[model samples]
Target: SLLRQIPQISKVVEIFAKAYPEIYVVKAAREVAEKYRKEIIEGARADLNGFLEDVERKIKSLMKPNIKRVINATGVVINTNLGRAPLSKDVINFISEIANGYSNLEYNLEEGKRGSRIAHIEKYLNELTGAESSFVVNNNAGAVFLVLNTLAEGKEVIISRGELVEIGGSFRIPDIMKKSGAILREVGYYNKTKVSRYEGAINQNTALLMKVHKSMEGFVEEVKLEDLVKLGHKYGIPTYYDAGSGLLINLKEFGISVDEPNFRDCISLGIDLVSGSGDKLLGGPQAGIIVGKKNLIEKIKKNPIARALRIDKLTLSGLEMTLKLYFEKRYEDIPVIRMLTQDEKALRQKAKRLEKLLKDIPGLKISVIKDKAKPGGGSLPELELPTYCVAIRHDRLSSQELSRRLRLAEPPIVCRIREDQLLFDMRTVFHEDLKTIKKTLQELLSI
Candidate 1:
């Protein structure tokens, strides 16, 4: 059997360790050989070169980060695969300092005592969202997990049937609730969940009234979130609102809302606990923002799981700096906001400039045309930003092949294909990356 020829993983791992000083060789070799064994075993009983070369390739792949910078020319602003949000440069530098050096993460220099990490961000959360209190976790999922576990474990939670949502990576709300030991009391229809059904679902076991804010463009009737808050308070059950795509400062002037309920309104609308992501529309690090009544927040903060899923110094610092920009009214400085707010006029100009630069390529045809860009990361699924893309078609290369080739370039370019052409949606492409895109296209389409 070819399995017999599979080299001893233990010894090979030792060699891998010495070869790749940067990676955990033992872990890498075990997985590589494990996968390689399965590959050869499935077929190739005789064609085996015995996995050394293939194993080396696998190990090399392991040496690089699975998470690399992928350009979002796909027009999805908060593209999850490409890292949902891009941080501000000033915030990046600020985080770098925290990451490289020690600071007052939990140490109070002025108070001469150990400080609370939550205290660092709590000040800003209060000011930003007008909550009685607030704190953060590693991400919004963790925040949701912790809050549900703390408040609704083994108790009934009333959630809208419409709101049993799954964000990126199949992280579903119903599943998270189940994991938290909270019993689900689903009410109303998928498209038309109302407060009257919510009124009927409560009982002695009802621990909380949960309203998931899903911006569905379905042909269905829905009730106001504030009204649900009313029902929750009337029932004396804690209310939980998951502002999935956390938007901080509103940008009505720029023609984009965070696609989620405004944090200020969500918090002020008597929502007991309003939690969302720091990364999505906040244009910050990946962390969960939980803001609400001080009492509710304190209970959530005290959960042992919270300590397990808390934010680190780098994330805390990055989020702080990002929030500070909002207070300073520097909306243009936040990368996510800046990208999200770029109107068709602005995007057309960008696409036009890139079009002029790349149109003359001998084997390639490029044109700017109107298209729609989405606010990805499960926000505003129905809403589309009117924008433009540089549609490119090569005489020799297929759209998929060209897109694949572009991804193999210096910095990977992620694009879409439509009408038998490669569409580079300029909505998400950075101004700095225009040169790179042009250069990559020129090189790929060399006549």
Candidate 2:
């Protein structure tokens, strides 16, 4: 039998280790041996030479990092796939300082006693958002989970069908509520829901009134935050708003005219609980920020789940410095804000410079052109910011082939591909990235 022909994994591992230095030879050998045995069982022939080649290939793949740092020339600020928001140099330096040494993460330096990690960022959050109190968790989903589990576990949480949004991934609000032990009492339709629909769903068993913010398309009408707050207060049920992107100020200051609701406005509208993402419009590390009534926040802090979802010292440091920058009016220190406010004329200049640098590359066609960029990551859906790009097309390379080569480069570069052209949008591409782009293109075409 081919199963009997399969080599012993232990012996295979010993030979593989000597052949592949400083590699996961033992795991690779075992995996390869098992795969061959399975193939034999399924009526396939096994070649021992092919087995060795597969192991070698696996070792090479293992040598590379699963997550490599890539330049984002996609011009999509708050890109979900590209690590959402990049941390500011200030926050990165502070994080480095905190990470390189021991931190007072859970200890009070002044009191010489035990302390809470959440204490570091709460005061700043309260001062900025006008909340009575605030706390943070792993992410916005975790924030919602802890709040629901702590406040409405085994009770009903009233929501509109329109607001039951799938945040990201496959995690839907309804699924999260189920996992948190809260019963979903959904009312009204997907396109529209009124304050009366919420009031109609209230009962003695109702524990909370939840509102989720999603900028829906066409013919959509959801109840206002003020109305929901009023309805919840009238019924003596706390209202929770999951303001996904943690926008601290109106984008009007950045020349954006979208009527996006900031957290401060929601807090001022009498919401009992407001949760947002720290990595999105907030321009910080990944965290779930919950701020609102003191009693609710206190109750949430006491929940055992909150402890499991607590942010680490690195996240705490990053978030703390980010909020401090807000107070300092140092918007440029935040990468997301800086990218959001960049003018089109400056972006055009950058595109032209990159185009000039890459113009001499052999067999490569490059041009500076006008384009549009998006504020992705599930925020600012319809708004397209004007931008400029250095578009490239190679005489010998298809758009797909050229894109693949760029991705395979050392310190991979990601850009937009359209109509057989690769676009490096200058809005997201930094000044430092220009040299890399030029060198990479020169090396790719052998200029």
Candidate 3:
């Protein structure tokens, strides 16, 4: 009878138990059996072996990391797809210690009262960026929300038509404006907006004047942040700049030609309020950071929504360390900034090393060649960092096949395919992981 055969399910349970010795065998087996109860009654399986095999596959899937790590060989630094700015070992280690135990997430040991999470990191944030006060929430989107909601709810936010930027995940400025209960008064054209346009758009109801740094490439002109901030002051209204990319340092010296504004400079420009990201060029956790006048920031900190949008202890720890590194002048310790600031000479050294490792494989032709890498995450759209790639071709496989094969490898290699060749940019590839990538490619050559 099928009921008797059901007892054979114990053997499948035994395999699961062997794998996850820490998992409760009884509960795990019972849960597995219940999943197939309906199919078993209908004799849906060709036999016990067939149903057991499916259960084995299910167990195998459960063993995989739900939050898996992948090596990014794609030259797009700060890649949103691959979890932007891979955290350094120190940040990861700091998180482990704070996350596993509990300290003062909201408990102030100094006074022994209910604490503020912002207070923990606000000092360093101020030191690094030189803002009068600061606040941190879950992300840049939230940072903008808290600012607008606190300062401009039911008021007007005047921005340039060209500055109506769309951030990641289809979140546009207009939508955020609407959600914050602020009226969006757009001014100027797609290519340019002048100081007069902003002045023409402002009135007694003007809550804020925003400048969105255009990420597209073209002959572009817009009202400068300082000029706009001064204009906002003329009307007795506050100013906010959603300077995307949340750049901590001036990257112009790195030879990046894009005219993107830095968070430090934006704050020092005396804008009443400023918003930026923690993950993009800043190289930290995903958070929206607001820095501005103390009075204005105090209102945001007290808003009812601030509690809901606040960051967890883990994010705070990672972000705090990331900010501290900038002041300590350990810029290279942050991964996203590290990759972006790396020189061509260093990048070429990596390319040559990878080329030398894969040179001997038969039927494959590999070359170390110059290439271009972009500062991804919507940061530097027009700038091309000088980089190098290990370009290769196989006698047997098509470019698509080689791409598919490498991506299918364990902890898959995310590379690029161009001009009928597979190109692995060594700028994004770490020297430590070179051996693993070598081993994976060597296996693919055989397969």
Candidate 4:
């Protein structure tokens, strides 16, 4: 029976070896044969050759690793699947350098003594946010958890009922609170909550007054930041504001009427602690940045969970480089910042160019249309980012069909379907991607 199975087994092994030379070929071959031995030799009415082929296919499918890199033709900035907020070229190079060699990550050059990793990022963060001090963890959620565990564990954290939100990956505020051993005291109505309500809820056991920025959901009317700070101070309670998507520059200065508060504003208002994500609006690696008074930050840094939530060297490098760009007045160098702050006239010109290029394709009609974009990644849900798009119409296909085909093409193109037309919002797409988009469409349509 073993002799009879030799031919098929050999064929599978040879093919597998050729496909994956790095794998231990002989070991893999033996393992595959062993795994399917019962089916090949002992199963009811066994077809040895057929089972061998099936085993080969199964092994190939199972062993193949998904290549993570993807051409983000999806115009949604902060596309989570494609690695939200792509690291800047400098940051990428820095990560590669650190990953390849041993560096003094825990050893400080200045003091000739072992140092903490947090020392590397603390200075730059303070410079960028104008806070008295700052610290970083793996992500925003971890930052919130560490703060809660350190300051309010077994104590009450008074937060508005409306602010108890569930974000991506089913992570909820109440869930995080429970894990931190903090009691959640919900106050005020969902749609309307007043500063007075938060003030009234604070008692002897209350440790922190928490306010979460509903970054994904747009807010209609809410109490102002100043009012909340005043209310917290009046009650002699420390307030912690989670500015979920952190911003270095004020959007108001750029002629945007959005009311999403920035870090500097939090500092000016004397909020006790401010926590935010470095990846969203800060446009760095996925990190949680907490900045405020040194006394509070020292407590958070010394917490045992701080070690559990600490970021590695690569994150430290990327975050430091990103924060330094702000100090150097080089915000335009960062892609996310540039995308957000690009001039309307310039965007219109780019749209015109794309419309011209695709206008004459057979069975395709193209037009430059005025459209509204948004600050994605749950940053500014209420702000409508005004922009332009190239709308495509196909006489032979529906918009959905056209979009589906584009997705299947090499370096797949992603666009929004609106009013029965496929619309590519150029806000997130770069001038370089335009060429790729044109080539993709031409090849897909055979135009």
Instruction: Determine the backbone clash count of candidate 1.
Output: 0
Listed per model in order, the count of residue pairs whose N, CA or C atoms clash below 3 Å is 0, 0, 3, 0
- Lowest summed lDDT across 10 adjacent residues in model 2 is found at 165-174
Backbone clash pairs for candidate 2 read none
Better of 1 and 2 by TM-score: 2
User: What does each candidate score in C-alpha RMSD?
Assistant: 4.2, 3.3, 3.6, 4.3
List residue ranges in candidate 3 displaced over 4 A: 1-55, 165-169, 216-218, 252-258
TM-score of each model, paired residue for residue: 0.86, 0.88, 0.87, 0.85
lDDT of 4: 0.77
Model 4 C-alpha lDDT per residue in residues 1-447, reported as the tens digit of each score:
643554554565666655655344444556656656645456644554554555555556556555534455445676666677876787787778887999888999988999988788888878767889999999998989998899899899988887765554345655776688788788887677877787888889999988887743355356787887787788777789888787766778656667776888888788889998888878899899999989999999999989999998888888878877777868777777778788889989988888777866788888888777764744455667777888889998898889998886667677778988988877778788787888888888884
lDDT of 3 at 241: 83
lDDT of 3 by residue, 307-354 (tens): 889898889998877777787878779887788878879998888888
Choose the strongest candidate by lDDT: 2
In TM-score terms, candidate 3 sits at: 0.87
Candidate 1: misplaced stretches above 4 Å? 1-66, 165-171, 215-218, 257-259
The candidate maximizing TM-score is: 2
